[PDB]
């Protein structure tokens, strides 16, 4: 199966100057947990921003530069490429990824910030008449989550 993993604020915001705008360790620790064991599918620029890739999963990037052969990770150059990927594979950014392969995905794992940050990058936006709302679970805030946000699991019609 192919599933879309995203965090976006009210206003589908995603990132500013490369990084997420927000800081929520609950989001972190959910987006750890369904990866684990699985593929992982990213854009350079979002993989030049973690750098350090996350072990116990498949971390993939696709960029059209052949030239680029960094240590412990598979490479991809289309979408194409993306059908011929065994087990469970998660879209996980960025923006320009996100854009694509929206239309393509099975179901949507999304944690929505409910707030309003500056961002430069975005989340296509999505009605829910596509989408069939399968889970709503509200975040629990603690002193380190201080921000309100729901985890979503569409499911398209
Ligand atoms: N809130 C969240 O859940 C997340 C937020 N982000 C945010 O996203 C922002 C980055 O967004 P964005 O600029 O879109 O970053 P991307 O990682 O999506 O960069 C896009 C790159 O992916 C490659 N690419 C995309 N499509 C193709 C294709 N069809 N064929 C070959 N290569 C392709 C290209 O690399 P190349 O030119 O080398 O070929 C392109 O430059 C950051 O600000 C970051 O903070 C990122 C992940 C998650
Ligand atoms: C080292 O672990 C990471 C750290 C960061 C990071 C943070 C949290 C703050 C500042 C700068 C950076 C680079 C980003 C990520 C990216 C890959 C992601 C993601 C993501 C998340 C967190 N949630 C949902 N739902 N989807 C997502 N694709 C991973």
């Known amino acids: 199966t192919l599933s879309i ?8 915001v995603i990132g500013f100057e490369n990084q997420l705008p927000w800081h929520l360790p609950n989001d972190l620790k959910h987006y750890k947990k369904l990866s684990t064991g699985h593929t992982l599918v990213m854009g350079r620029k979002t993989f030049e921003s973690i750098g350090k890739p996350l072990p116990n999963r498949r971390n993939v990037v696709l960029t059209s530069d052949t030239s680029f052969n960094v ?23 960025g923006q320009t990824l996100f854009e694509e392969m929206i239309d393509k995905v099975d179901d949507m794992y999304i944690t ?17 008449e596509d989408w069939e709302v399968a889970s709503s679970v509200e975040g629990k805030l603690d002193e380190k989550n201080t921000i309100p946000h729901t985890f979503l699991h569409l499911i398209r019609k």
């Open 112 to 128: 929505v910030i409910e707030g309003k940050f500056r961002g430069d990058t975005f989340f296509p936006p999505y009605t829910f």
């Open 5 to 12: 993993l995203v965090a976006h604020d009210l206003q589908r």
């Open 71 to 93: 240590e412990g990770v598979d490479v991809i150059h289309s979408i194409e490429d993306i059908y011929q990927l065994p087990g469970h594979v998660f879209i996980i950014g």
